[PDB]
Design a protein around this ligand. Structure first.
Ligand SMILES: CC(C)NCCCn1c(Sc2cc3c(cc2I)OCO3)nc2c(N)ncnc21
Length: 432
């Protein structure tokens, strides 16, 4: 068995610790984080991992920048049921003495579950001394020079009396696989490797290719088919977004990460209700019921444009897509309030036309681009094609030289009825 242990008692303090009042901001902040900020107390494990990752990254960066060799870059967790402790060490960039004295606020979440926190840290900088940092989370911490400290940071948590659960390996394992499956550096628990998954949404879209997208699709959608559609969307311009969206090839939710770190597996609010058929992940740093709105919209127009290009890249596959998911588009159109929201989604609708061969579809805008200036969009629900063609109501439009849209289902017609008007033109039935 591949048992990797890097965690042991090498640290010793020769002198005495100097005592140290928190600054008036930090006392209140610590209590806010430890007693209010988070709703689930397990997330401390999450936060401490995040920090660890960060440390490691800038270490890595730094070294690769200076152009020197890379050491072991790992994150280790150790549980101890009888000392009743949980420990997290990283071999990343450490903390200088000033960095410890002065100030990664997620760290303080540790005091949500601990009644004493014990830290050993040593900067990666050349000729850096190790230091010990101690605190009961009141208003007093202690600082002392320590020896036998490895480069990086070791955080030892002495759990509260009824928080002993986080000294159990099974519990901690569950928490880890829950929030930290996609950690960017190798993570071990009690000697055993945990994370195997690659946060492929952080990648460059050009560097990810099919088998990866399939693996991840099956992961987040918990499915066995393949995605029929794939949109890898990165942006920094409006807000920060690293997202992947899949449309299942089976005919009939998105996870919210930030930090390559899970926040909610069921982010139903991140996409509009009519795009609930979409699978995948949204990763955004601008995420602490308002900005989620901002993001939800941003994703909505992004996805709409996506499906439009999909139409104009492969109209037959998109035709099938409209047959399998048009339900959601009609629902979303009727559901919308502001008009051109309705029209935006309406750009995804595909219907048969009198000026098109029976079987072929077009959109409203396509229709309009052949609509001779002069003002109205004509449609008609018949049971089938040839019945619409032989409707007197249409045969009044045949030699009147006008194109007419053909619906074959009541929900389509109700949709166009609700829509009322689309871009500088109203939708009228030829039975009016
Ligand atoms: C390098 C440092 C300036 N980055 C700021 C975040 C501080 N920090 C943190 S959060 C933190 C941790 C503390 C602390 C204050 C913070 I904020 O006092 C006792 O230990 N974790 C780090 C880690 N594993 N490696 C390197 N730095 C860490």
């Amino acid at each position: 068995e591949p048992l990797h242990s890097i965690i042991s008692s090498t640290e010793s303090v020769q002198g005495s610790t100097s005592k140290h009042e928190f600054q008036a901001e930090t006392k209140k902040l610590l209590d806010i984080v430890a007693r209010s900020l988070y709703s689930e107390k397990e997330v401390f494990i999450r936060e401490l991992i995040s920090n660890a990752s960060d440390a490691l990254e800038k270490l890595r960066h730094k070294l690769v920048s200076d152009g020197q060799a890379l050491p072991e870059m790992e994150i280790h967790l150790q549980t101890n049921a009888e000392k009743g402790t949980i420990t997290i060490q990283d071999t990343g960039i450490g903390m200088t003495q000033e960095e410890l004295v002065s100030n990664g606020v997620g760290f303080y979440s540790a005091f949500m579950v601990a009644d004493r926190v014990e830290v050993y840290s040593r900067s990666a900088a050349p000729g850096s001394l190790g230091y010990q940092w101690l605190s009961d989370g009141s208003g007093v911490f202690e600082i002392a020079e320590a020896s036998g400290v490895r480069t990086g940071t070791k955080i030892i948590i002495h759990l509260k009396s009824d928080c002993k659960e986080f000294s159990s390996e099974a519990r901690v394992r569950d928490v880890v696989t829950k929030y930290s499956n996609f950690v960017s550096f190798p993570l071990y628990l009690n000697g055993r490797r945990m994370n195997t998954l690659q946060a492929i949404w952080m990648m460059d879209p050009k560097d990810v290719r099919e088998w990866q997208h399939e693996e991840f699709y099956r992961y987040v959608a918990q499915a066995h088919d393949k995605p029929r559609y794939t949109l890898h969307y990165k942006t920094d311009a409006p807000l920060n977004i690293r997202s992947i969206f899949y449309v299942p090839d089976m005919k009939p939710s998105v996870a919210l990460y930030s930090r390559k770190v899970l926040i909610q597996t069921k982010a139903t609010d991140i996409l509009p209700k009519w795009l609930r058929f979409i699978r995948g992940v949204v990763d955004s740093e601008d995420i602490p019921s308002a900005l989620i709105r901002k993001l939800r919209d941003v994703l909505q127009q992004r996805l709409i444009k996506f499906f439009i290009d999909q139409s104009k890249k492969d109209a037959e596959k998109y035709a099938k897509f409209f047959e399998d998911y048009g339900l959601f588009m009609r629902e979303g159109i009727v559901t919308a309030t502001e008009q051109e929201v309705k029209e935006d989604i309406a750009k995804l609708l595909r219907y048969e036309s009198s000026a098109l061969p029976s079987g072929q579809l077009t959109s409203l805008s396509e229709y309009a681009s052949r609509m001779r200036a002069g003002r109205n969009i004509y449609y008609l629900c018949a049971p089938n094609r040839h019945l619409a063609e032989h409707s007197p109501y249409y045969e009044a439009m045949k030699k009147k030289d006008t194109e007419v849209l053909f619906c074959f289902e009541q929900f389509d017609e109700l949709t166009l009825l609700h829509l009322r008007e689309f871009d500088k033109k109203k939708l009228i039935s030829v039975e009016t």
